[PDB]
Design a protein around this ligand. Structure first.
Ligand SMILES: *[C@@H]1O[C@H](CO)[C@@H](O)[C@H](O)[C@H]1NC(C)=O
Ligand SMILES: *[C@@H]1O[C@H](CO)[C@@H](O)[C@H](O)[C@H]1NC(C)=O
Ligand SMILES: *[C@@H]1O[C@H](CO)[C@@H](O)[C@H](O)[C@H]1NC(C)=O
Ligand SMILES: *[C@@H]1O[C@H](CO)[C@@H](O)[C@H](O)[C@H]1NC(C)=O
Ligand SMILES: *[C@@H]1O[C@H](CO)[C@@H](O)[C@H](O)[C@H]1NC(C)=O
Lengths: 195, 596
């Protein structure tokens, strides 16, 4: 009855950021040691949660949101941040309590000639609400002229593809990300540490 | 809602699609240049075609957003850079002819060959062969056959094409709201800017002419000195108060006097400083050379190189079986991909090249914080000036000592310093007249101030008066000699080489004042100055984001060209030259000619 973190971090396939994947970690015993021990992680920042005290504690739910973005965007996955990713792909609330973990994926998610399978939303009429998800393909009407679904002048398909070639720089390189949200109120605590 | 908002959105979409298509062109261009195969020729051609087709479409689309309603200057700059299309305004029948002329002129230059009256079967091409003569020969007549033959077999063929080229190009500019093709070229120095940082295309001429005024006394004395020394080599054909014959200047045109060094060397017994032997004796390699270069930028506060650079660059001729281009090229492939292709040898020159090309990479790396379209130098003169200040510091005897290639006890002698500043003058100061005069002629042909009936009369009048240079053989209007130089047959502006030069030495003088240099500027190394690399990086950061006036002011404190820097580098030689030319005439007569 362990909590399945290796199903999130050690997953073979990751998601695009506009279609970020969410997994519920509920009613289970948590091995946080795997997370903190591993030195593969190039980003491990927690807001609201003390990484050590988690073993002592219990939370009703732990959500594991996974996606792929590029290295110079990893900074956007944090409270108060602005940007394409924060505004149009994946938003964290300003009162966010949890941890953000990222690592370099160039060995897996990059390809000679490029891997254009991971995408992101370039335009959107409004900024995403905290933990919102937009999988719509509707043509972005920037001007007053209706687009009629074809796409054209001032009328753009709203999703663009990252291109990941192994020779890119670190800020243009693929980064697999995991956001762990810890919820300690308004439901019966079910995810406990080993303590 | 507003047009500016639509433009920002337009630009954001462009940037995402352009960055990847540009990058893909760079990648295919790199695989051809490091693996010369027919397969990679196709893919380089095909990838640059898709990108070129994309860039044109976007330029037309960009014109749809009117610049008048764009309040953001950074958005404005990007739209401007995109909106300029070129020959697109011309009718398609015209446009095909213009490219027919252009491709013909370029092929004539590349496939042109001249034959010696003696041995009517030994015909030679420019590269190699004629170019060898014009750089290494000390025979008056041998060099004359080459100079006249080039301007005869190739220049005469190019004459009618060039006259058509002027008319079509002039219309293209007139249609694009420019007075002439020359005004069109001079827009690369235009800047709308905010307050005090605007620059008019006409103002470029003013500033080129006032500054060249100030270079003239230095050029005269270098010219008088070379004439005297050449009088010993060519006594029958040199007049001590006259211009110099154009076929005796050290290359096919006299664009650099660098190869007159053997014959003009002030102190021939004193040898030049060449750390080549040290590097070989200390078992240096390409890797060490580039590591020292990275250390030089690290010493001033700049970025280390990227792991990609080290992993992905060609810093040595491949061997394997791969044919490669070995011309030293710094790249920026896009997207944090920063590479150099040098077939690096363990020589002082390639040591010095590495420092220049990594000053490219380092400019590349600082302006990559900028929108794709605002990621170049502030003008066409800034980029090679940044590389140049890096060869200047690294060849100083003090750097070469500190890094262990010159013994700690090295004799800096006044004679070896003068012999240096001469070789520099023959390259750097030599070209400054050649450059200005080419471009004045073109600017003035394009304005129509030079009739076609007088083209090559004013050409050679102007070489006489300005460059101090005279026609070996007389030449009529059956000739286009302007256009027996690459850049003129292959439709490239030339004043970049003049503008580079004045910037170069303005940048060095200011970085060397922040490193608090005591003494002659020709001996300045900026190594270990964190303050200098701040000022440098405050410019390099900007790219083409702000006016070029403001980019200069951030290094140098001044919004325009000043030649006072250049002159102070060379003031050592000026003094020597004047005393060595005191029992000589300084200047030229426009009248003498080798033939009459
Ligand atoms: C992934 O696998 C490695 C090695 O098999 C293991 O050390 C690590 O704990 C795993 N990660 C997770 C999240 O369980
Ligand atoms: C050279 O190009 C050929 C195709 O022309 C390719 O198969 C080969 O792998 C390339 N070699 C290298 C090392 O780039
Ligand atoms: C111009 O637009 C850019 C968009 O990134 C914005 O950051 C900037 O503040 C705007 N203002 C000016 C005048 O630079
Ligand atoms: C890059 O610069 C940093 C910061 O000084 C330095 O610690 C690091 O060792 C340098 N990288 C190299 C040369 O490995
Ligand atoms: C920079 O300082 C270090 C330590 O003082 C010295 O070894 C090195 O030679 C200096 N570099 C230069 C060229 O000033």
């Amino acid at each position: 009855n362990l909590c399945p973190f290796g199903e999130v971090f050690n997953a073979t396939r990751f998601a695009s950021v506009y279609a970020w994947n969410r997994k519920r970690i509920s009613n289970c015993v948590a091995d946080y040691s795997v997370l903190y021990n591993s030195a593969s992680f190039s980003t491990f920042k927690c807001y609201g949660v003390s990484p050590t005290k988690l073993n002592d504690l219990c939370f009703t739910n732990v959500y594991a949101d996974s996606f792929v973005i590029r290295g110079d965007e990893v900074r956007q996955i944090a409270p108060g941040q602005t940007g394409k990713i924060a505004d149009y792909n994946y938003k964290l609330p300003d009162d966010f309590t949890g941890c953000v973990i990222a690592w370099n994926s160039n060995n897996l998610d990059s390809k000679v000639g490029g891997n254009y399978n991971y995408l992101y939303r370039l335009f959107r009429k409004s900024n995403l609400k905290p933990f919102e998800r937009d999988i719509s393909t509707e043509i972005y009407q920037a001007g007053s002229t209706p687009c009629n679904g074809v796409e054209g002048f001032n009328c753009y398909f709203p999703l663009q593809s990252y291109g990941f070639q192994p020779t890119n720089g670190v800020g243009y390189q693929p980064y697999r990300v995991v956001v762990l949200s810890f919820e300690l109120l308004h439901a019966p605590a079910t995810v406990c540490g080993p303590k | 809602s507003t047009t500016e908002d639509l433009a920002k959105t337009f630009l954001e979409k462009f940037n995402s699609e352009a960055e990847e298509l540009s990058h893909q062109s760079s990648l295919a261009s790199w695989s051809y240049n490091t693996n010369i195969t027919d397969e990679n020729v196709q893919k380089m051609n095909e990838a640059g075609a898709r990108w070129s087709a994309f860039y044109e479409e976007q330029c037309k689309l960009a014109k749809t957003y009117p610049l008048e309603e764009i309040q953001n200057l950074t958005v404005k700059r990007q739209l401007q850079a995109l909106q300029q299309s070129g020959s697109s305004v011309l009718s398609a029948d015209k446009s095909k002819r213009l490219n027919e002329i252009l491709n013909t002129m370029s092929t004539i230059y590349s496939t042109g060959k001249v034959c010696n009256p003696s041995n009517p079967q030994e015909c030679l091409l420019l590269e190699p062969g004629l170019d060898a003569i014009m750089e290494n020969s000390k025979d008056y007549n041998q060099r004359l056959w080459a100079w006249e033959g080039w301007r005869s077999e190739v220049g005469k063929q190019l004459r009618p094409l060039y006259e058509e080229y002027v008319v079509l190009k002039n219309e293209m500019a007139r249609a694009n709201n420019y007075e002439d093709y020359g005004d069109y070229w001079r827009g690369d120095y235009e800047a709308e800017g905010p307050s005090g940082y605007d620059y008019s295309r006409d103002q470029l001429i003013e500033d080129v002419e006032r500054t060249f005024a100030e270079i003239k006394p230095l050029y005269e004395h270098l010219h008088a000195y070379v004439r005297a020394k050449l009088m010993d080599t060519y006594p029958s054909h040199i007049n001590p108060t006259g211009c110099l014959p154009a076929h005796l200047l050290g290359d096919m045109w006299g664009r650099f006097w660098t190869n007159l060094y053997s014959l003009t060397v002030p102190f021939g017994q004193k040898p030049n400083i060449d750390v080549t032997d040290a590097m070989v004796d200390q078992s240096w390699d390409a890797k060490r050379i580039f590591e020292e270069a990275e250390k030089f930028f690290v010493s001033v506060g700049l970025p280390n190189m990227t792991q990609g650079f080290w992993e992905n660059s060609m810093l040595t001729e491949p061997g394997d079986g791969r044919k490669v281009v070995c011309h030293p090229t710094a790249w920026d492939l896009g997207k944090g991909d920063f590479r150099i292709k040098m077939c690096t040898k363990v020589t002082m020159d390639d040591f010095l090249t590495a420092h220049h090309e990594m000053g490219h990479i380092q400019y590349d790396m600082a302006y990559a914080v900028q929108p794709y379209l605002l990621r170049n130098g502030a003008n066409e003169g800034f980029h090679e000036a940044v590389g140049e200040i890096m060869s200047l510091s690294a060849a100083t005897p003090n750097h070469l000592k500190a890094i262990g290639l010159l013994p700690p006890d090295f004799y800096e002698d006044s004679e070896t310093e003068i012999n240096f500043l001469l070789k520099q003058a023959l390259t750097i100061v030599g070209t400054l007249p050649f450059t200005y005069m080419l471009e004045k002629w073109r600017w003035m042909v394009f304005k129509g101030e030079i009739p076609k009936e007088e083209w090559m009369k004013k050409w050679w009048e102007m070489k006489r008066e300005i460059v101090g240079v005279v026609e070996p053989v007389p030449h009529d209007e059956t000739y286009c000699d302007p256009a027996a130089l690459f850049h003129v047959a292959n439709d490239y502006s030339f004043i970049r080489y003049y503008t580079r030069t004045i910037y170069q030495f303005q940048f060095q003088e200011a970085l060397c004042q922040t490193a608090k240099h005591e003494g002659p500027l020709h001996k300045c190394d900026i190594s270990n100055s964190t303050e200098a690399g701040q000022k440098l990086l405050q410019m390099l950061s900007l790219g083409k984001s702000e006016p070029w006036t403001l980019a200069l002011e951030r290094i140098v404190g001044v919004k325009n060209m000043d030649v006072r820097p250049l002159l102070n580098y060379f003031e050592p030689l000026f003094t020597w030259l004047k005393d060595q030319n005191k029992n000589s005439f300084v200047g030229w007569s426009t009248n003498w000619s080798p033939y009459a």
